[PDB]
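Quick one - inputs below.
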Amino acid sequence: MKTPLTEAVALADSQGRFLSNTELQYLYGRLRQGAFALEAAQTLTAKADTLVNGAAQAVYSKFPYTTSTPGNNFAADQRGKDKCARDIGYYLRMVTYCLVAGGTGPMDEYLIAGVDEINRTFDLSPSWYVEALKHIKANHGLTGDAATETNNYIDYAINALS
Amino acid sequence: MKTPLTEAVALADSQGRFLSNTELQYLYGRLRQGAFALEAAQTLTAKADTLVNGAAQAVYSKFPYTTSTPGNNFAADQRGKDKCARDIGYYLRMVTYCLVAGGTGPMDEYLIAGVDEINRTFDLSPSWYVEALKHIKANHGLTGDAATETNNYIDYAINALS
Amino acid sequence: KTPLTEAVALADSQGRFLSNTELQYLYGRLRQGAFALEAAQTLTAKADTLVNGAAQAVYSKFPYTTSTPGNNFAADQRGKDKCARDIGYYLRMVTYCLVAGGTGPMDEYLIAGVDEINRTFDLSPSWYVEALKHIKANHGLTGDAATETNNYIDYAINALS
Amino acid sequence: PVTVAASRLGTAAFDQSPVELRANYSRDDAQTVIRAVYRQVLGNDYVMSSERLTAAESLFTNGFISVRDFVRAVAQSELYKEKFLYNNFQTRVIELNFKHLLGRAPYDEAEVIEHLDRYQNEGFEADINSYIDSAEYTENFGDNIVPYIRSYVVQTGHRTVGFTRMFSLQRGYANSDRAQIAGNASRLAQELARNTTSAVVGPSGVNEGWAFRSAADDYHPGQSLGGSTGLSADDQVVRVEVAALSTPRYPRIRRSSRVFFVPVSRLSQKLQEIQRMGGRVASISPAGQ
Amino acid sequence: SLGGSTGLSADDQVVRVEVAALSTPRYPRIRRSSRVFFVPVSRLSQKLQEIQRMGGRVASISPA
Amino acid sequence: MFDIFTRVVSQADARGEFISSDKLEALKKVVAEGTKRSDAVSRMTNNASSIVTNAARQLFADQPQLIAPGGNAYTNRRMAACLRDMEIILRYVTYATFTGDASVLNDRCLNGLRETYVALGVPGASVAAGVRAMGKAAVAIVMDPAGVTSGDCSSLQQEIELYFETAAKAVE
Amino acid sequence: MFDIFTRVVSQADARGEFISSDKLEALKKVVAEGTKRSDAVSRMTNNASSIVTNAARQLFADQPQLIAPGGNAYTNRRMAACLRDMEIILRYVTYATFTGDASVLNDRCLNGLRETYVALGVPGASVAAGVRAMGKAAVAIVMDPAGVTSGDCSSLQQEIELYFETAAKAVE
Amino acid sequence: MFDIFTRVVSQADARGEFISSDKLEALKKVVAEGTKRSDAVSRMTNNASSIVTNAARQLFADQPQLIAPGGNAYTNRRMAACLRDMEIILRYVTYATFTGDASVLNDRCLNGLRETYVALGVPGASVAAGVRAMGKAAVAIVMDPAGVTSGDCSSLQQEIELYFETAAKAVE
Amino acid sequence: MFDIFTRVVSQADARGEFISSDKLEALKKVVAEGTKRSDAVSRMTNNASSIVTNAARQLFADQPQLIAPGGNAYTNRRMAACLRDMEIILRYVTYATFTGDASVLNDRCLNGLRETYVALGVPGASVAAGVRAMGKAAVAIVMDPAGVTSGDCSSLQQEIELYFETAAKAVE
Ligand SMILES: CCC1=C(C)/C(=C/C2=NC(=C\c3[nH]c(/C=C4\NC(=O)[C@H](C)[C@H]4CC)c(C)c3CCC(=O)O)/C(CCC(=O)O)=C2C)NC1=O
Ligand SMILES: CCC1=C(C)/C(=C/C2=NC(=C\c3[nH]c(/C=C4\NC(=O)[C@H](C)[C@H]4CC)c(C)c3CCC(=O)O)/C(CCC(=O)O)=C2C)NC1=O
Ligand SMILES: CCC1=C(C)/C(=C/C2=NC(=C\c3[nH]c(/C=C4\NC(=O)[C@H](C)[C@H]4CC)c(C)c3CCC(=O)O)/C(CCC(=O)O)=C2C)NC1=O
Ligand SMILES: CCC1=C(C)/C(=C/C2=NC(=C\c3[nH]c(/C=C4\NC(=O)[C@H](C)[C@H]4CC)c(C)c3CCC(=O)O)/C(CCC(=O)O)=C2C)NC1=O
Ligand SMILES: CCC1=C(C)/C(=C/C2=NC(=C\c3[nH]c(/C=C4\NC(=O)[C@H](C)[C@H]4CC)c(C)c3CCC(=O)O)/C(CCC(=O)O)=C2C)NC1=O
Ligand SMILES: CCC1=C(C)/C(=C/C2=NC(=C\c3[nH]c(/C=C4\NC(=O)[C@H](C)[C@H]4CC)c(C)c3CCC(=O)O)/C(CCC(=O)O)=C2C)NC1=O
Ligand SMILES: CCC1=C(C)/C(=C/C2=NC(=C\c3[nH]c(/C=C4\NC(=O)[C@H](C)[C@H]4CC)c(C)c3CCC(=O)O)/C(CCC(=O)O)=C2C)NC1=O
Ligand SMILES: CCC1=C(C)/C(=C/C2=NC(=C\c3[nH]c(/C=C4\NC(=O)[C@H](C)[C@H]4CC)c(C)c3CCC(=O)O)/C(CCC(=O)O)=C2C)NC1=O
Ligand SMILES: CCC1=C(C)/C(=C/C2=NC(=C\c3[nH]c(/C=C4\NC(=O)[C@H](C)[C@H]4CC)c(C)c3CCC(=O)O)/C(CCC(=O)O)=C2C)NC1=O
Ligand SMILES: CCC1=C(C)/C(=C/C2=NC(=C\c3[nH]c(/C=C4\NC(=O)[C@H](C)[C@H]4CC)c(C)c3CCC(=O)O)/C(CCC(=O)O)=C2C)NC1=O
Ligand SMILES: CCC1=C(C)/C(=C/C2=NC(=C\c3[nH]c(/C=C4\NC(=O)[C@H](C)[C@H]4CC)c(C)c3CCC(=O)O)/C(CCC(=O)O)=C2C)NC1=O
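Output:
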């Protein structure tokens, strides 16, 4: 729940003080981020289906063996392909929430808390979703402050993922 | 760490009592385990080179892609094969120590503490060592109480590994 | 103090599943019980003669508790009844301690506050010490069961004094 | 620091300033702080000398080992596991560790995940270490002071909740923490995940309705839906809780302790009816409107 | 460090951190600035983070 | 904890779909008026302590039984406790209007305000009237501009009015 | 916590006026008999532990089901717990008659005595009869003078009798 | 906490007499089959984690609303919480069949399983069906011998079946 | 902490090779005499407290300056502290001969025995002589068989003699 307004509130709660001017600057920074983050989330939501479709196909061409061998993590038949594409769509939707929230909190709470543990107990590999996010950050094709703020969120997910 | 004599000592330390008869029974059970565990460790040390060699070759045939693609975890060239065979030899040596110590303590301290974390940061897969230990527990070919005590240690490493 | 339950408490504190150490612990408990049950059987057969000889031996061991009128001592017959009740309680705790595989029935039911009630009632633990000495001299058993019971008895003696 | 009906809430016994271990304490002052540590961490449970752990205690009496590490030592001990970890539920064990070490009631569901998650991941030995190695721990009493209940003071950082959840946790002064009305069950774990608080009750005799406990099946919320639209009375409504209903008997009364919701206009008549049943009133709190 | 690991109740070795120059760190309101503590490696990271967060400079660390 | 952005996120995650465009237009309106959130929070945090004293002033001019001996606000310790209660109540109002969501004030005051006030014997009527007068004074200092560039502020007025009525029906 | 002087202070502060003269005459009577408070507290604290053993003696001669196995006072640990309960009960009686106000005994025993005794399964009847017999023995050792200068002590007799009946209806 | 030996001890102490001979013959039968307790506990602790994944497999093939967004087991954090719940449930089953008494599982799960599951909003139906399927798979891996010396195991089958039905009617 | 098995494991891990066959034959000898470790530990733990009193007996017959006022063992509190020191010293000797390695006794007594004894003012000479006499009495009760089946025990005699001399040069 990493939200700079709420993190400022949690800070001033821990201090027990009233609202300081540091928090006013914090609000200014949040507005400065949101003033392009909302439009970036808009075009991401426009592009999202082509993004997850190209990302799934690129990961399938990236490792041929997950299509090849019959296994439980891998997409041998079409149900595994559905679960795989559901997972990358989940990832990109977390990216959009992470962008629109102004912080890593939706990402943190909804993915980062136990991702490596379910990857351990299901024998998944995080590198699949790493190269998926690499294809997404190559595919969104944006420019400006919004593009690199989204790219920052994406490589944060990559770093915490690996 | 995990030796039934030392666990009994740690228990009686926490109670602050003298040696009770429960600890005498604990010592009896440890002697009962060791009376075949030592001979089992002997024949394991006799078989160890063929075990790790067949286990490495079986994992290489188990997944052809680690031989195939050039990568940093995978054994593309021969140095990765050396590191891979070093890892399975490390595993089997931990199994022998785990057997001769009477408990899971050498395994716990020397492998189980951070194995999934280095697998995460190096992008290894634990399932490789899982199927390696499956080949070892298929290959040792022993019978009796010692065989299943070793098999218990091996599947403990498998369960904690995955 | 039960080695199965102590193993469970250990694995609870570790938070692990059942290890093979606990399997060996169970093996040791079965090895103890395989004579402990028969020893508890012959103790229960002998118990009345044991407590009767132990009470008479403690009465001959110190003549003054029969002699002087006091509240701890057995001047009249009610104190003799309470005294024999106490040694019968002791031997029954010994049998439970044997059949449980550990000192837990002894610990919970005697050892927790025995010296405190001996302090506030002005009893002497040495009476029950020499009583347990007479019991461990009187049971007359041999083998692993005999010395396991003797170990429990001198544990009660050591914690008693 | 209450000082109005402090008798009624039972927190009058916890009035005193905390105990502080000096730089060169005497042997008797050591024993007082040891008795305070035993009483607070085991929750006014008295200790036998066989379970006294005199060996770990002597190291503290030297001064080589701090008071906070002695608190760690008694919580690392097997007797604390046998009294509290073993009989109680593990969520209830987390609840007890909040009173025993931090000195306050838990505030939300996030702390009970963090300690359950930690229990499965690393053990009770590590969980206790996480309670004591805390900023919330070290602020209120760093090394020298005993743990003590801080929930009655705001302390710049209490949520409201812990004040009232503490009275579900502890009763009185005489009450030993192993031994409560509910026994094995955990009071607060129902309250946490719904994010709700029950009404504050004081301990017995001073209050005679102490017997009332909310049923686990029936929540009975405080507000009762609309300032009594459905009860059809113009005045505001108060919650009323009765402790026993024993005069009425078995075929008339299925359960002794129940919650009524009344307007104030009919309050007097229902209170008279309760007294006619010989029932004594636990709590009465304003409900709605 | 007497007892080695008994009163600390963690089997791992003891590091014996000595800290100096502690001045209004938090609410504990400690009587002197420089103190010597005994920590094991199992909780050495937590106490070291606490020592630095308080405002203290560790002056010596010597395994006992 | 919950911000209005995180409110929209939690709605869109409970539905589990992407966020609607019109909701994003509402958020564009929100970030357009974030400077007015800053204006209001700065204005009333500038005058907050004097607002607390004036609220206690009207309360103690209104109900002299509190100052009267045997009253609940009679003693010096309890008087400081009163001013503590009002100050932290106004503090959580400032938290809520800074965040934009009442969840902070609700989740950190609604739970045990009524509970402490019935358990101690605190008359909830005086705190309700006091937080009402404090809210009126807060709207009075927020709305009027003193050398401030002009604009409409009716939505903010509605927001802090709602926050103070949630406080008032919290304590009752 | 509350002494009879502080009782008078709390009454005079709840009224908020100065203390009446006749109440001060009552306090003059109290400080005139403070040496008899000292006489009584010293006398029964001299014999307190033997009083506890004699109370347990009459209780265990009366109800042999407690000593009987399965009884609540059967085990050695529970027997020491019994003597602990009676000793600290007599200790708080001595606290109350030293202070002169029953508030210490009430506020540190009335709250959870009944509560622990119904929660554990402790029969409150035996503790009530035991504290009654202990109170009779306490009056017996307090009232009779042994080499003590003579005087009237009926008010003190009434006081500790009231303290023991508050204990008896505390545990019930 | 309570073992079947300590169960017999607690019965014989509540009666307060020595243990009957036929009960000691039953305990002789118990120590005769203690190696089969070892056989079963070792067998199912060998395969325990794969049993947990297969139970979650059948549960998530059965009820796709849990994986569906807005479901209780939907999120990654809650999914790990699910596997945590099932793993510690099977862990306490292994504790109970190692001890031989259901008191460990009852006293450390029966108390707050239903409580947490109604307080969180967890559907107890899915956990009940999952622990039933997990118990069927556990009997399936325990009973069939793979290179194990032959014997009868019907009493153990009854025992773990009873343990899993106590878990199932614990969560409901 | 360190057992002789774990000693062999730590040597074989520091070398990083598999264990030698002759060392495994030594361990076969060790598990062959583990019943004699049990015999000795049981024998001296049977008589341990009386051994402590007899050691204090010879110490206090030897050095009457300790009982003499101003002596270090003079006071009742310090006398109980003395018996505490000797009892826990014999306890760690029993720990070491049960484990078979002196590492437990070293790592939990060698560190601060000398340190406490020079810091308090405790004469280390008396503790050294007392642990020597206690070790002689311990060998005396261990070695002689009373109704015990006969065997050689010279290695155990050497082992506890080494343990008591490590204690003696620990305190000095
Ligand atoms: C909001 C964030 C979020 C994510 C990302 C998430 C992922 C997630 N993926 C899962 C499984 C899975 N994930 C895969 C995925 C793959 N195998 C392949 O071929 C591909 C390489 C890869 C596609 C990414 C498969 C095949 C399963 C089922 C494993 C099996 O069938 O046993 C599971 C276990 C439950 C289940 O589907 O059956 C979770 C919880 N959950 C979340 O809450
Ligand atoms: C005593 C127990 C113990 C174990 C098991 C252990 C394993 C271990 N394996 C490692 C790396 C590695 N492990 C592998 C292994 C593989 N890639 C493959 O082709 C095979 C499938 C697999 C053989 C198992 C490779 C290739 C590396 C180096 C990763 C890379 O080169 O960047 C590393 C990182 C340091 C390094 O070698 O360069 C550790 C610590 N360490 C221990 O202390
Ligand atoms: C299950 C274990 C267990 C034991 C052993 C036990 C002993 C026990 N013995 C007691 C008293 C007593 N014990 C004695 C005993 C003696 N005086 C003598 O002449 C003999 C030397 C000695 C016989 C051992 C006497 C005389 C009393 C009553 C003290 C008195 O009458 O005031 C009491 C005080 C209550 C009472 O009887 O009246 C307890 C609790 N309780 C237990 O729960
Ligand atoms: C962060 C959220 C939060 C809030 C709001 C909070 C309130 C709170 N108000 C309290 C007391 C109080 N509140 C009042 C209030 C009043 N005086 C009156 O008579 C009027 C009706 C009203 C004047 C404003 C008084 C007098 C006390 C002291 C009560 C006592 O002494 O028992 C107490 C009792 C502790 C103390 O003595 O300071 C708490 C915990 N605690 C929290 O954690
Ligand atoms: C300072 C005020 C204060 C009081 C008074 C107090 C009493 C108190 N009495 C207790 C137990 C007890 N009280 C008794 C009492 C009796 N035995 C009987 O059968 C008779 C009916 C009665 C004899 C006098 C017994 C047997 C226990 C132990 C109950 C148990 O083992 O569960 C316990 C349970 C803790 C323990 O095991 O020691 C507490 C907390 N605690 C306090 O903090
Ligand atoms: C804390 C230090 C600090 C302050 C004060 C700050 C104020 C601030 N208030 C502003 C706008 C504004 N602020 C207001 C707010 C108000 N005007 C009214 O008439 C109402 C009385 C009041 C609302 C309660 C309005 C109406 C605007 C301009 C149009 C708009 O954005 O609504 C702006 C935008 C441009 C400008 O007018 O300067 C700034 C920078 N920024 C800061 O960093
Ligand atoms: C603790 C060490 C200590 C003691 C004992 C002490 C006693 C004490 N009791 C006294 C008076 C007295 N004390 C009593 C009390 C009693 N007389 C009775 O007949 C009743 C049996 C009993 C009341 C239970 C009476 C009647 C007087 C004298 C007149 C009066 O003050 O009431 C006095 C006043 C002058 C005197 O008589 O010596 C002293 C000093 N002071 C101390 O420092
Ligand atoms: C030692 C005994 C013990 C048990 C058994 C125990 C259970 C327990 N299960 C919990 C949660 C949970 N349990 C589930 C269960 C499920 N998911 C579903 O939807 C299905 C119906 C079921 C799948 C198996 C879920 C999703 C949570 C997380 C609930 C939440 O996030 O609020 C929680 C809340 C804390 C957390 O977030 O981890 C506890 C305390 N705690 C204990 O101390
Ligand atoms: C953990 C390391 C370890 C293991 C495995 C162990 C096993 C073990 N299982 C045994 C007996 C046995 N175990 C079984 C149990 C079974 N047989 C079946 O057909 C069922 C499928 C299964 C019960 C679920 C039976 C039937 C016997 C022999 C007769 C009996 O005791 O009932 C015995 C007695 C002699 C023998 O057969 O070797 C041992 C030592 N001891 C150990 O230390
Ligand atoms: C687990 C390992 C361990 C050991 C061995 C240990 C010993 C230890 N012995 C101590 C004291 C003592 N040891 C003695 C010893 C003696 N009296 C004499 O004069 C003789 C020379 C010798 C008789 C045997 C005395 C008198 C004290 C009390 C010293 C004092 O009062 O300052 C103290 C001081 C604390 C106390 O007052 O009890 C410690 C910590 N602590 C440990 O943690
Ligand atoms: C604690 C309850 C308990 C006891 C006592 C126990 C004793 C025990 N001591 C034994 C052997 C033995 N124990 C000894 C030891 C000794 N003999 C001597 O002459 C020396 C005086 C002494 C060594 C200090 C010897 C010499 C043997 C037989 C041959 C050998 O193993 O060395 C054996 C093997 C077979 C037998 O002789 O019964 C047992 C079972 N087991 C138990 O569970």
